[PDB]
C-alpha cells in the first residue's frame, strides 16, 4: 500500500541518538514530494539525489533512521562530519545517497526540570564506522586500572543525558531527526513513487 512515513515521522516517542532506530521500508508506494511539500522541517538536505526526482525513482530498500539530538548537532548528520555525534553516535558514509530531515521538537521532548530520557555517547575509544550502532553501556576505562563495572575515578558512564529544558537556547533545544537511506542492489526495486 502507501509507504509508512507517518509511522516514522509522527511517532509519539523517538530514540536516543546512541541507539538510533532503523525502519526498513519495502514493497510500497512512497510520495517523496508530499514529504518535501510539508512546511515544517528546518532541514531537508539531499545527497546524491533530488527531493522531486526522488518521486520518479525506484529503490531496492529504503531505511528510516530516527533519533533526537540538539540543533547545533544537526550539522553532524551529513557525510564527512566530525563531533561527538558523527564520531560516537551516528556516522553517515561519504558516498551517502539519501536525505536528512530535521525539525524542532522542543514542544514534545523538553520537560520543565529537564528531559533525562534522551541520551548520547560521550566516551568511545575510536570513531564509529558508517551506519554502526553501539549500544554498549560498559563502564569506560580512561586510565590503566580496570573498571570491573564500577563507575569511579577514570571509570566513566559512557552515555550522558541531554537534559533538555524548555528554557534552553534554540541551538541547544531538542530536534527530531529522520535519515532516509536509499538502497539500490541487483535485486528488484520494491520502493517507488509513480511506477
Amino acid at each position, epitope marked *: 500500500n502507501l509507504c509508512p512515513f507517518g509511522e516514522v515521522f509522527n511517532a509519539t516517542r523517538f530514540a536516543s541518538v546512541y541507539a538510533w532506530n532503523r525502519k526498513r521500508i519495502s514493497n510500497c508506494v512512497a510520495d517523496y514530494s508530499v514529504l518535501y511539500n510539508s512546511a515544517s522541517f528546518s532541514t531537508f538536505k539531499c545527497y546524491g539525489v533530488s527531493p522531486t526526482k526522488l518521486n520518479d525513482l525506484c529503490f531496492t530498500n529504503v531505511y528510516a533512521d530516527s533519533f533526537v539530538i540538539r540543533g*547545533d548537532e544537526v550539522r553532524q548528520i551529513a557525510p564527512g562530519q*566530525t*563531533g*561527538k555525534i558523527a*564520531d*560516537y553516535n551516528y556516522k553517515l558514509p561519504d558516498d551517502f545517497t539519501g536525505c536528512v530531515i530535521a525539525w524542532n521538537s522542543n514542544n514534545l521532548d523538553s520537560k520543565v526540570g*529537564g528531559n533525562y530520557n534522551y541520551l*548520547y555517547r*560521550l*566516551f*568511545r*575509544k*575510536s*570513531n564509529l564506522k558508517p551506519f554502526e550502532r553501539d549500544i554498549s553501556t560498559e563502564i*569506560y*576505562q*580512561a*586510565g*590503566s586500572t580496570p573498571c570491573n563495572g564500577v563507575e569511579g*575515578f*577514570n571509570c566513566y558512564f559512557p552515555l*550522558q543525558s541531554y*537534559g*533538555f*529544558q524548555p*528554557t*534552553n*537556547g534554540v*541551538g*541547544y533545544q531538542p530536534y527530531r531527526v529522520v535519515v532516509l537511506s536509499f538502497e539500490l542492489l541487483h535485486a528488484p526495486a520494491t520502493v517507488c513513487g509513480p511506477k
Partner: antibody, heavy 120, light 108 residues
Framework: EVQLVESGGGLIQPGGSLRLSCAAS????????MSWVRQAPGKGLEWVSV???????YYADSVKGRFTISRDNSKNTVFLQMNSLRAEDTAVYYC??????????????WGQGTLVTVSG | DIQLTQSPSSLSASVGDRVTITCRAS??????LAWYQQKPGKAPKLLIY???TLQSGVPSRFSGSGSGTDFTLTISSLQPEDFATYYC?????????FGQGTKLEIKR
C-alpha cells in the same frame, strides 16, 4: 597520583614557531579529551584547543590554522604546535583533561602551566 | 554566541562569612557550567561541575546552584585559604567561554 607536566615554553620572536608538550601520568591520554587553555598575563582564561579519544580536533577561532594539537600514545604526551605566533599569543599555556562542549565534567586535572612569551 | 556575565568583579569578606558569586548566561545552557578556583601562580582547580555537583576532594563548604541562565557559587563559611579568583565556565558549546573572574579578598 595524576600529574600533567608541560614543557616547551619560553621566548619566541613574532612569527616564530613553538612546540609545547604535556606529559601525563595517572590516566591514558589516548582514551581522553585533552584540552589546552591559555591565560594572558594578568587576564582571564581562554580555551585554545581539544583532541578527542577518536582523533577529532577542534580549535578556538583565534588560533585556527596556526595551532595544531597532536599526541604520542606510547609517550602519553599531548603536543600543541604553535606556528606564526603573534604578541597576542603571549600567555601561560595549560593542558587539562576534559572538553568544553557538551562535557559536563569540565577540566579536572590541569598542568602547572608554561609561559610562552612572544617578543622581539 | 554565549555571553557569561560573572559578578561581582571583586569582593572582600570576613572569615566565617557566607560568600555568593553569580554567573549569568546569555542563552539557556541547562546545567553545563563549572566553577574554578585559581590561587596565585597556580593552575585553576575545578570546584563544582554540572552546575551543582561538587568535585572529589573539594570541601563541603563549597556549593553550586542554578540551571538555565542564572548560576551561583556559595562558600558557606569562608576560610583564610579561600582567597583566590573564582571563574565560572560554560560547558555547553565551544569555545567553552569562562567568566571574567571574581577576586575574593579575606577581610582581616
Amino acid at each position: 597520583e595524576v600529574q600533567l607536566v608541560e614543557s616547551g615554553g619560553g621566548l619566541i620572536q613574532p612569527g616564530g614557531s613553538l612546540r609545547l608538550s604535556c606529559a601525563a601520568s595517572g590516566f591514558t591520554v589516548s582514551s581522553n579529551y585533552m584540552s589546552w587553555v591559555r591565560q594572558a598575563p594578568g587576564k582571564g582564561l581562554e580555551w585554545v584547543s581539544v583532541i578527542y579519544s577518536g582523533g577529532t580536533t577542534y580549535y578556538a577561532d583565534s588560533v585556527k590554522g596556526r595551532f595544531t594539537i597532536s599526541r604520542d600514545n606510547s609517550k602519553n604526551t599531548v603536543f600543541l604546535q604553535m606556528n606564526s605566533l603573534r604578541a597576542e599569543d603571549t600567555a601561560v599555556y595549560y593542558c587539562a583533561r576534559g572538553d568544553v562542549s557538551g562535557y559536563r565534567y569540565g577540566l579536572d586535572y590541569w598542568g602547572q602551566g608554561t609561559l610562552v612569551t612572544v617578543s622581539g | 554566541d554565549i555571553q557569561l556575565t560573572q559578578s561581582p568583579s571583586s569582593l572582600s569578606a570576613s572569615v566565617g562569612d557566607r560568600v555568593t558569586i553569580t554567573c549569568r548566561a546569555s542563552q539557556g545552557i541547562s546545567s553545563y557550567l563549572a566553577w574554578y578556583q585559581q590561587k596565585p601562580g597556580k593552575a585553576p582547580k575545578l570546584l563544582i561541575y554540572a552546575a551543582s555537583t561538587l568535585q572529589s576532594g573539594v570541601p563541603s563548604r563549597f556549593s553550586g546552584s542554578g540551571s538555565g541562565t542564572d548560576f551561583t557559587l556559595t562558600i558557606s563559611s569562608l576560610q583564610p585559604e579561600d582567597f583566590a579568583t573564582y571563574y565560572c565556565q560554560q560547558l555547553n558549546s565551544y569555545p567553552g567561554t569562562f567568566g571574567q573572574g571574581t577576586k575574593l579578598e579575606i577581610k582581616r
